[PDB]
Amino acid sequence: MGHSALMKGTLTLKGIPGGAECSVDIQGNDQMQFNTNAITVDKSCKQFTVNLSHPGNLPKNVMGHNWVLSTAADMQGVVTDGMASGLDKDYLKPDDSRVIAHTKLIGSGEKDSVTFDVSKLKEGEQYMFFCTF
Ligand SMILES: [Ca+2]
Ligand SMILES: [Cl-]
Ligand SMILES: [Cu+2]
Ligand code: NA
Ligand code: NA
């Protein structure tokens, strides 16, 4: 139930040869899909920015999407507690210690960005991004 089983992917801190730009553009659509399942963040990025958008036509209460980052070990807990927190809390437990970064929940035609400190990540750790809707 909800989007997290399908709308998820890995996020990995790596030394990308030569550096990389410090953002990613990601979309969630009307078919419960993100347009990537693997994001790499370069070590030398001080901040990283995720720009989420929602193309198509369905409203937030039917096909709402957020982008939520946690350790892979913490994902299930965040999803469970987020689902229980409900639509009016953007399907996130308020102040959840396990959420490294998150956007708001968006419907069709909306956009949201989140920037976070890359020092909150560690090489070797498994991170997941996901929608908790
Ligand atoms: Ca935001
Ligand atoms: Cl659903
Ligand atoms: Cu979603
Ligand atoms: Na690099
Ligand atoms: Na980029």
UniProtKB/Swiss-Prot annotation:
Record bears the keyword Disulfide bond: yes
Cellular component, GO annotation: periplasmic space; plasma membrane
Disulphide linkage map: C22-C45
Domain Plastocyanin-like: from-to ranges: 20-133
Keywords from the named record: Copper, Disulfide bond, Electron transport, Metal-binding, Periplasm, Signal, Transport
Protein's cellular compartments: Periplasm
Binding site for Cu cation: H65, C131
Keyword Phosphoprotein: no
Top-level taxon: Bacteria
A GO MF term: identical protein binding
Function, as annotated: Transfers electrons from cytochrome c551 to cytochrome oxidase.
Name this polypeptide is given: Azurin
Organism: Pseudomonas aeruginosa (strain ATCC 15692 / DSM 22644 / CIP 104116 / JCM 14847 / LMG 12228 / 1C / PRS 101 / PAO1)
